[PDB]
Every structure is written in C-alpha cells, then in structure tokens.
Ligand binder design. Sequence first.
Ligand code: UK4
Lengths: 338, 244, 57, 393
Amino acid sequence: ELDQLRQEAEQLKNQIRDARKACADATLSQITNNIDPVGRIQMRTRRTLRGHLAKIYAMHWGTDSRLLVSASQDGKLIIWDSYTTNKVHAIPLRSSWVMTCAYAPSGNYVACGGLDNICSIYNLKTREGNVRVSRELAGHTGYLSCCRFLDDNQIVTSSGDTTCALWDIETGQQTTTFTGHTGDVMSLSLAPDTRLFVSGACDASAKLWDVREGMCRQTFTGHESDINAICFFPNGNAFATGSDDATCRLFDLRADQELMTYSHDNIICGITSVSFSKSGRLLLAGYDDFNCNVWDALKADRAGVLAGHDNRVSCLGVTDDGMAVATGSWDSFLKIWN
Amino acid sequence: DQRNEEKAQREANKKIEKQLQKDKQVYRATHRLLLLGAGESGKNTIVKQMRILHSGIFETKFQVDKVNFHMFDVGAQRDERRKWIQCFNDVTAIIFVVASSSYNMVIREDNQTNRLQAALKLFDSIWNNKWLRDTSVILFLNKQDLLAEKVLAGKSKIEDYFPEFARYTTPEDATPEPGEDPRVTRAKYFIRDEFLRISTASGDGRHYCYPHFTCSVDTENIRRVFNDCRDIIQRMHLRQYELL
Amino acid sequence: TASIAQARKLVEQLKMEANIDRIKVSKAAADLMAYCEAHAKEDPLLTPVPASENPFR
Amino acid sequence: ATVSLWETVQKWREYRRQCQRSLTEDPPPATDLFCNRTFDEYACWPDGEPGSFVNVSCPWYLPWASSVPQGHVYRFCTAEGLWLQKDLPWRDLSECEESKRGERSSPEEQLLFLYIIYTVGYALSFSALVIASAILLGFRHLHCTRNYIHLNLFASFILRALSVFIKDAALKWMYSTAAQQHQWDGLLSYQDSLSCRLVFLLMQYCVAANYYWLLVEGVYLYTLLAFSVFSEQWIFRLYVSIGWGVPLLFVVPWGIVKYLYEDEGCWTRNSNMNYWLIIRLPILFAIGVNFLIFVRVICIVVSKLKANLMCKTDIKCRLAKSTLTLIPLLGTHEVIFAFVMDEHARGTLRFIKLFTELSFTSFQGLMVAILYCFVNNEVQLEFRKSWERWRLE
Ligand SMILES: N#Cc1ccc(COc2cccc(C3CCN(Cc4nc5ccc(C(=O)O)cc5n4C[C@@H]4CCO4)CC3)n2)c(F)c1
C-alpha cells in the first residue's frame, strides 16, 4: 500500500533528521572565531583569452595547470596555452548547443556535451590531433550537463534525465547508472581519490555516489532551489554547492550534514560555477551579476571579487598547482586571474 | 627550438584565429529560430514543409532570398523547459505554434487539460521568462481550416469551452478574407486576442509578437517568418540609434 | 500496482542512509582547518607568491 | 551690404595695375626740370609742372567715388623741382572724403559678430566632440561598426572646425576691417600667396569630407534598415574610402584648374569662367542623396510606429523625437541652407551668406556629440558600471 510505505518513509525521514541533529554541538563559525582572518585579497586579470564567437558555458584547467579547453555556443572547442596566450587546437563541434566540457587528468582527452544528449570524447594526442572523435557516448535521453574523467577510460556524465552515469569509453556503454534524483542533474565533481563523486540536481538536493558500488551512499539537502555547481574540498572529505537561491553551502561527508553557509544579503543572482583553492582556504564562486566572488572557506567571509566580465559568468576553475584561476563568461572571453 | 616553439605556436595560432574569422562571417548572417509548440499542434508538419522545400535536439537549415535560417526543435518530456531555455537568449525569434482548432480537446486525457489553455499556459511562461526578455515570438495559429469546420455548427461547440466568447464582438480593424463566413471570423479573432492579451501587457520595445493565421499546408509560412525576422532586425537597429 | 516497487526502493535507499558512521560536527570542523594550516604555505593564491615565482607576470 | 573693404581692396588692386602700366609707359615729358610721377598707395600723380598745382582726378577704387566724380586731389610741386613737404608731401584730399555714417552697422561689423558666433560654435563642438571621442574610445564595450562610423564623423567635424580655425587665424581679418591704405598692400600680397591658397584648399577639403561622412552615416543606416547583408570589413573599408578619398576626386581637379588658370587671388570664385562647379556640384549630390536616405528612414520609422497599437498624439511625440535626433546625424538642415544660398554672388555678399550658415551650422558638432554619445543610454549605463566597480573596492 502506498499509504503504508509513504508513512514509513515519512517516519524514517524523522529518524535521519534526529540522527544529523544529534551530532550537532558546535557550529563551524563559532570554532573559526579564533583563527586569523584572510584579509582583503586582490587579484588581477593577467591574461585575457579571446576568439570565441558566441557565449561560453564551460572550461576545465589542465593537469599541468598550463593548458585548458573552452566550449562555446558557436559550435567550437578551443584549447589554450594560458602562459603564452596562444591557442593550440580549434575543434569544431557537431551540435552547436554544448553545455559542458572536460579535460582528461592524463592530459590526453577532452570531452564536451550538451542539448544533443551525446557525450563526445576527443583525443588530443593523435596523428592529426584534430576533429577525429574517439567516442560518441549516447543513451542518456536528456541534455548532458557535466562530465569529468575518472581516467582515460572512465568518465562520469550527468544528464537532464535525472540520472548520472559511469561510461566505459572503450566499450562505449554506461557501466553503472546512478539513479535517485528527481530533477535534472546540473553539475558533478570527482573526488581526489576518484572513489566517490557528488552531484547536485534540480531537486535541490546533493547525493554522494560510490563509483564502484553504484549506490547513493549519502544524500544532502538544504538548498532552496536548483544546485547549479558543486566541487570537493582538496582533502576529499567535504564539498561545496552553488544554487539558484544566491547561496553557497559547505557540506561534510563524514559528519553527514551541512557545515557552513556562504551568502550575502546584497547577492540576488544564483551561482553558476564554484571551485576551491589549493589549500581549500578560498572558495571561489561565479555568479550571474558578472562578478566572481572569493570566499574564505573557514570563516565564510568575502575577501575579494573578480569583477571584470561583461556578461554572465558561466564557468570557473582553479589550477591543480593553485597558481591561476580561469573564468569564462557569456561575453565569449576567458580571463586568467592571479 | 624554443624560438621555433613560439614560431610554431604563433603559426598554429594564426591558423586558429583566421578560421575563427570565417566562422564569424556565418554566425552573424544566420538567423536562429526556436520552435516551441505542443506535439499535436502541426509543428512537425510545418517543419516538414520548411525542410523539403530547401535525440534531444533537432536541426534544419533553409535559405530565404539569400538569408540563412537555422531552426531548432527541442522535443522535451519534462514539464520544466527551464535549464535548457536559457541557451536561446540569442536567437532572432521564437516560432510558437498553436493548434487553434484544438479547443474542446484534452491532452491524452491527462488532467482533462484543454489543449488550447495548455498552449496559453505555455505561451505565458515563455513570454514572461527572464532569459528571453529581448527575443520576439512569431505566433502561429495553425489549424485554421479545422477551426472553421467546428465553428460552423459542428457538435454545437460554440466555444462554450471559452465562456467570455459570448461577450465577444469582432473588432472593426479585423481583416476578413473573402470566402470566410462571419461566424468563423468571430472565432478566429477571439482566439488570437486571447494570446495578444498576454503579449501586450508584459513587454514593450524589447520584444514583440507577430500573430499569423497560418495553416499546416500553407507555403506562406516560410514567408511570414522571413518578413517577421526582417521587422525584428529593423526594430533592433532603430533602437540602437534611439530612433524608436 | 507498480508503484509499490518504486516506494519499496525508496525505503531501502532511505534505510542505508540512516545507518552510517556519523561523527560530531566539532571534529568535522577541527579536521577541516588542519588541512588548511598544513597547506597554507603551499597555497599560491592565499599567501601572495612573489612576482619572481609567478609564471603569469 | 553689397560692398565692403573686400571690393574696395580688389578695386585698388586693378587701379594699381593700371597706374603701374601708366608709369612704365607714359612718354617722358619734352621739357626738363619735371616733377617725378609716383603712386603713393592713395592716388596716381603724373609728372607735373614746377611751381604749379597738380590736378589729379579722384581715384575710382574708393567706395564713395559716386558722390564726387568731379573731385580732385592736390599736390603742389615747387619751383625747385620737388613736391611740397608738410614737415608723404603735402596733399589736400578734403575735396574727396566720405560722408558721415548715419548709425549704420556695415557688413564688417556684422561679419565680425558672425565670426564670433561660429568660432564659439566650433569651439563648443570641438570640445564636446573630443570628450565624446574619448568616451567612445575608452570603454571597450562601446566598439561597434556604427560607433566606428560615429568616430569617423566626429573626426570629420573636428577637422572641419580646426580648418576653419586655421583659416581665420592665418589671415587676421578680425582686426583689419578698418585697415587704411598703407595696410592694403599686405592684405593683397597675402591673398595671392601660396599659403592662403593652400589653407583655403585644406578648408574646402575638410568641408567636403564632413559632408561625405554625413552621407556615409546615411548610407550605412540605410543599408541596415534595408535588411541588406554584405561583407562588413569589405564594406567598412568601402565606406571609409567613400567618406575620405572621394572628395579627393573633385578637390584636386578643382585645385589644378584653379592653379593653371588663375593669376591673382586666394582661389575665390572666378570673374569670367565657371570653375566652382568642380567643388559645389558633388557637395549638392551628397546632400541630395542623404536627404533621400532621410526620407526613406523616416518612412520606415513611421511604418514601425503605425504597426504598434499606438495612441494618436503619443505617435507624434515619438515621431518628432526620432526625426529631431536624426537631423544632426544626416545634416538635413543643409538642404534648406543649400536652397537659401546664392551660387552666383561674389565678395562681401557671398561672405555674409556663408557666414550666416556657418553661424547656424557650427553647433551641429555639439548636437551630434550630445545626442549620440552623452545622452546615449548605453554610454550612461557604462558610466554607472564603471562607477559601481569602485563601490566594490
Ligand atoms: N584682399 C583683401 C582684404 C580686404 C579686407 C579685409 C578685412 O576686411 C574684410 C571685409 C570683408 C570681409 C572680410 C573677411 C571675410 C572672409 N575672409 C577670408 C575668407 N573666408 C572665406 C570662406 C569661404 C569663402 C568661399 O568663397 O567659399 C571665401 C572666404 N574668404 C575670402 C578669401 C578666400 C580666402 O580668403 C577675408 C576677409 N574682411 C581683409 F582681411 C583682406
């Protein structure tokens, strides 16, 4: 009976509610009252990478922390050399509605995805090193929103069909499908150990997934609207979200409950992309008001603004070595901050 | 070597930036159109005519008097068009197709929802979207010939489905085509004014609505899109010079 | 009908969520800062790195 | 009103020519102990008897020679063979004077006021236009093809104002409106000097370039509203060429025909032939084409306004505003000024007719700068954007 099972779930929600409430004794803000504040941080746009015709949604820093890839609505992929500002490759795409891009951790592959519902795997190091596509992953039945390579042969993709997936590129068929979300999944982040990953969806909830088991290990709630972005802390024991309600929240896997809130009264536009720093002290978030804010992760204070973009900021990334921060926007310009 | 590296990159760069110029002389001369309509609205029949004359995304390309058009149809199962409607803020126009005869019909018995009221509900959400506040909507009232059949005493559907219709009189500026009964005109301009009520209040000087009494078999639908896209561009330039 | 299985899977998924090892929030905060103090010196953007070391100058 | 110091000096020029010829080729008097004939910038005294008055008819270049056709001017040569030194030797020119000016403000005192007004107008236009060019070049987001055309139009206006400044400052006629006889020699040797001709030619070219850049504004706006698609680079370069180097096609031929068949003067309209056509005809052609473009554009605007559901008199409130702000961009007052101009007038009359139109069309640069840069809602919002970024800091 639906009434019986729904009433059991209603009660079982209460037990988990008290389970999280039991572990809450001291707030993160109260303990971080003694630590030294970060102070006002000023960054400047060192390089500015131009050439895209239409607006941009995605960018992903390389493993060497020098290269990166940019996907734009004009149906183009473009690879950059953030040091010399010179381009490397300009790969035209088949569908002109691309919503995400990725860069392989080995530096060999880049992947895009969008309204075409297809995940395209591009090999950079090839005889031509060009439009020749290595694999066209299909089967999502919904617009693909975010892709992040576990390896050269495994890539996790989140789509609007409310289900995430793990793709064996050689076979081309999704090895494991992650279901449980009720709304469209917008962003996903890989853990550093790459044994777990987290996804935030339109249902205003985040879920922790075991890439090997395939089960929703944990489920985090609290946001009042769609989660547009998500990333892990560098240690792998935490992650932060970016939602449409103009709030960023820090969760904990081990504590299983929300830790910190990153909000300001004079912010009204929803966050589009978030990322963390090398030490995890700084949480950078890209908003719709054309300015990327810089947050002190431990104290929730705001210590800097990267206000240099003409149109909406859509993507955001911090290098693996922590040297630089890239920003893409709807004005079709990439801006490297340092 | 390292000298040649920058000479290799700048030559690799010079190939990248030249082709991006040629692709900039196509993206600017191309008019991108988004089709938003119900499944049983004749939208697919309209697409068929526009393509032959010249799975989440569907495209097509037709040139009208040396003007490029790129039309995108998005088959969507979710009721929430959001999170993919943002990607169309830069399209030149949205072609909204409505089956006018579909009054008194329900959507596969789903919530016994009237298909006409569903189209009005869909139109209002797209016309009042923050991301599409500058994009104009070319409205197509498609199933006109089927509408005439029911209006002339078919099942005595007097549009009593729409109550305010009894309080309707045809405006004098309405242009009746020859061969059209006065009773048909009372129905057509009631349905059109039902939509024009939505568009008139929401936004002015940012984006307009261009109603048309098309038919699925009509070949003038391509021409109506061309003339409306010409007027949309012209109204944009006149606003740039602050002449409107 | 068929929604019994769907509601059944919801209860199972919700049960594995109830029985997990959950630490105090105090230890959660304490071991989050320790990662920052350990890598504060290594952080390039936190402590201003000298222009001589920046590759973006 | 019809004659001023200009034609007095131009008559004195030919009078000096005739008297120089007379002095060179008058036969020497048979008797010796004569009295040397000379031209003292005022009268033309022939060789005279000693100890006898010299009767010279009053010269025909003076503007007041109508009232004294019987007048004479006098010099007394002495019995020792020389004129009568007063302390120029003694001359009694009372018999040919000028009548009193009965509270009349001559064309000089009017041309001075017109000069003041149009120099002030070009000063304000120059200042507003350099500020507007700074604004349009500073903000990087305000970089469109239409804004490049606006910048070129601003440059044409600035160059025309500067050329007028240089012309007026080079020949300081602002003070020489009361120049006496001794100042007319320099006033005439400057006119037929190369510097005056080159300054006039440069001013002519700047005028033509300003007209053709208003025409280019009109043509670009027409191509936008005609829903025409062309290779914009290959069209921006074409418009730049039309606006700058097409006046060269009818200014240097005019310069050559005024350098090959003109002996004296600072390249003012000829006395017998019709050489001004090479300059004034294409200016009229550009003004006419641009007026046709203005007609088409206002027709498009009225069609758009009538398309909307608009009230009867709000229509005119917006129709007037769209037309008023369109006059400075195309220069549609220069059809009225082209119709009220006399193309066959010369001299002081022509100067006054040009100076009134200059006095009115000077503020056109100021109006263009105000309308298309300073009150431009894009420029205002860019100002707000760049002053909220200091509110972040
Ligand atoms: N000889 C001699 C002479 C005689 C008198 C005085 C002083 O008294 C008077 C009296 C009346 C007018 C004036 C000034 C009024 C005008 N400017 C200079 C001047 N601007 C011109 C603009 C357009 C045109 C045109 O045809 O399109 C032609 C233009 N011209 C005349 C010639 C052309 C270059 O200079 C010259 C003088 N000044 C003197 F300064 C020189």
